[PDB]
Ligand binder design. Sequence first.
Ligand SMILES: *[C@@](O)(c1nc2ccccc2s1)[C@H](C[C@@H]1CCNC1=O)NC(=O)[C@H](CC(C)C)NC(=O)c1cc2c(OC)cccc2[nH]1
Ligand SMILES: *[C@@](O)(c1nc2ccccc2s1)[C@H](C[C@@H]1CCNC1=O)NC(=O)[C@H](CC(C)C)NC(=O)c1cc2c(OC)cccc2[nH]1
Lengths: 301, 302
Amino acid sequence: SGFRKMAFPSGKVEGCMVQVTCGTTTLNGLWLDDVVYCPRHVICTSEDMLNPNYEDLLIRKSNHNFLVQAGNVQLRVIGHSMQNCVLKLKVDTANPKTPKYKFVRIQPGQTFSVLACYNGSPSGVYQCAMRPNFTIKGSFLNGSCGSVGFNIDYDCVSFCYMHHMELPTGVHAGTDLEGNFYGPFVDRQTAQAAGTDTTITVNVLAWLYAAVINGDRWFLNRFTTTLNDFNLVAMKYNYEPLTQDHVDILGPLSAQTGIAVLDMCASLKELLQNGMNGRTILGSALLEDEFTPFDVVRQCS
Amino acid sequence: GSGFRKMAFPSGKVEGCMVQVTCGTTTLNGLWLDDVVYCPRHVICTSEDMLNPNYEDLLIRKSNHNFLVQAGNVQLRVIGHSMQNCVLKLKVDTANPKTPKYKFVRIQPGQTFSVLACYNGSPSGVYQCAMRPNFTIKGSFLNGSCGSVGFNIDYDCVSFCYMHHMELPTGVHAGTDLEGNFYGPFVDRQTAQAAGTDTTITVNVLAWLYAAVINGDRWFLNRFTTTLNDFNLVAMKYNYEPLTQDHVDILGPLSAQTGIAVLDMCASLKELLQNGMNGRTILGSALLEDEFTPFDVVRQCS
Ligand SMILES: *[C@@](O)(c1nc2ccccc2s1)[C@H](C[C@@H]1CCNC1=O)NC(=O)[C@H](CC(C)C)NC(=O)c1cc2c(OC)cccc2[nH]1
Ligand SMILES: *[C@@](O)(c1nc2ccccc2s1)[C@H](C[C@@H]1CCNC1=O)NC(=O)[C@H](CC(C)C)NC(=O)c1cc2c(OC)cccc2[nH]1
């Protein structure tokens, strides 16, 4: 029993974190095999950061300009290249702690674990979702750039995020490990707004199932709805549409609880229309949308 | 601000200590540090032993050769065994090369810690827990989770504070420190046990009010103060835990950061309890949070 946001164990990723310094800029890097991946703006000085012409800035650097430290050991940089918003530093030493890994671009609504790091040292681990507007609601301070997000499947680490930016609203923006931003953001020192965010409907439904599994049932009702009728209401409330694929993915939770997915939809419609009236679900005064169906099953057997 | 979230400590130093301990068909998690493996003592129980085990008698029948300790699929030879309170200590013939700097600490109610939930010695996930005033934790633990540990990490030293043993009827969890002493009145037997009525963790609500002030959300501050005793007597009326002197002392850094004396913040909380929120929110919420400690707040604000 019980229901907490749960991150993946972070050890496989901790053994890959290093510090990268160029000039007096320092951030975190990810050391896999003989390459260190980090945000390209390690090359920037404060004067570069507003209008960086990154190709120009990079051609002005050589290998010996990059200081890579794994703990208190310097790794020698023997080559460098830029891929989108990431720098790739080839070093002379392979990381024996490299896990089996893949680089993946995650879909909006999927969750991943973040290993927040400072000065190449892991500080904390927590679960985030890629929002529909391609921000993440993380917890990142100065010095966090180059921290990564990942999922683990068996023994294989799927890296999906590298941290670059905090928006004025306090949410965060970053790239995949190919260095392509999620969302309409740019690696420069400007105040950037996101598109209007929406709530991840399939994940709210997953979390309502979690609530029923854990004995919190006050919001259920005897009624049902159609998929299209539900979607009309969802859209009106800035919830994402629910697809038939989402209904399919919710099938195991539906089976486990005996609540049909469209009946759970009817429960959620009533919560959107009426509110919670000062009641809580799983201790929350808000509808939670950062658990996927996978995440609920993993936790709820 | 970003909002506060439960953040766990990175779990790698603890992952490198997890093993499985089997007796018969019963497998629990254990913790390998140096040349000792620590696990719950009820790994020695059969189904028939579990309602009222005579652990001293049960253990006399076990030999070193009855314990199967494995790190992954690799067996770790047991060369001695003893029982300390509700944990078994298995001396093994290999010192764990991944042993971190570590301590065993007994935490107080209100303190938070990370749990590495494991099944058959293999870690599933990591999450942040608070010890409730009634010495339960609102954990997330399935069959096969016993012997998973709770810990904090401070400058590369792991302070282990919890090992998992039990789910109460109410769905909350109970366990021991790493010396095998239960937190709270619980015992390791297959019986339905009730915890005391839970209370709200006052020290942590005060930390949350300090966090609100740090982030510019300060409508609830008043120009009054209270005595500690008067505050504790009001707190009890609202099912809030009384403050200890230790609580007052761990609020010291937040009090310094904000310039709001602890007893002045207590007067502000008292007014919130007596009058309510009256439609207003703090840090975006109509509910007061009680599972972020003074340390957690400073960590997330800096
Ligand atoms: C990240 O740690 C980096 N810091 C530096 C410092 C020097 C060179 C390069 C980098 S990357 C950092 C993470 C941020 C800090 C606070 N919390 C975070 O998550 N990222 C940045 O500082 C980033 C650098 C860009 C060059 C990519 N800038 C911003 O996030 C940023 C800039 C603004 C801003 O500029 C006028 C206005 C409002 C918001 C804002 N965010
Ligand atoms: C833990 O994983 C263990 N399982 C076994 C199995 C065989 C021998 C020893 C152990 S320890 C397990 C964790 C629980 C399972 C569900 N969620 C959890 O957190 N602990 C127990 O199963 C524990 C064993 C005791 C001997 C300590 N028992 C209980 O938690 C328990 C027993 C009862 C109960 O008995 C009639 C009634 C109500 C509640 C209850 N909880």
